[PDB]
Amino acid sequence: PLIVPYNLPLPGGVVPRMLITILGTVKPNANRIALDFQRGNDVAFHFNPRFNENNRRVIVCNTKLDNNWGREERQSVFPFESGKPFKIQVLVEPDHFKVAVNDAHLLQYNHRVKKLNEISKLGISGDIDLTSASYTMI
Ligand SMILES: Cc1ccc(S[C@@H]2O[C@H](CO)[C@H](O)[C@H](n3cc(-c4c(F)c(F)c(F)c(F)c4F)nn3)[C@H]2O)cc1
Secondary structure, eight states, X not given: OBOSSEEEEOTTOOOTTEEEEEEEEEOTTOOBEEEEEXXXXXXXXXXXXXXXXXXXXXXXEEEEEXXXXXXXXXXXXXXXXXXXXXXXXXXXXXXXXXXXXXXXXXXXXXXXXXXXXXXXXXXXXXXXXXXXXXXXXX
């Protein structure tokens, strides 16, 4: 397995038609997972499965600008399961990141950070065994 937290450079930033694929297995009794598409210290797109937020499972998405988190976007469809292998696909579209988990569409996140070419790393952290993280153009 790859070492978590893992940094995946995104050379030249992201662009529409770029597909990022993350394969891993959720740890037993997981609490949290995060993907962080970063523009320097800013987080353009934070994708954060929470397994126990007041006894509910929820995906929280947000952006961090100058160390401040913005308005959260929440999704109660929750396709992750402790102990189980998953696939996350993040497709960059012109106006949003489009996320599918285990081949099922999950959510879209409209671009708040609009300098897509400056979003040039992806951090992967939290309660997973990370098998692979890669990108390709579709
Ligand atoms: C005013 C206010 C008060 C409380 C909060 S709570 C905050 O909410 C954010 C989304 O709006 C982020 O989720 C943020 N956050 C989570 C992580 C994280 C992770 F999600 C992992 F999965 C992980 F493995 C790890 F190491 C982490 F550090 N880092 N920052 C959270 O602290 C936010 C605003």
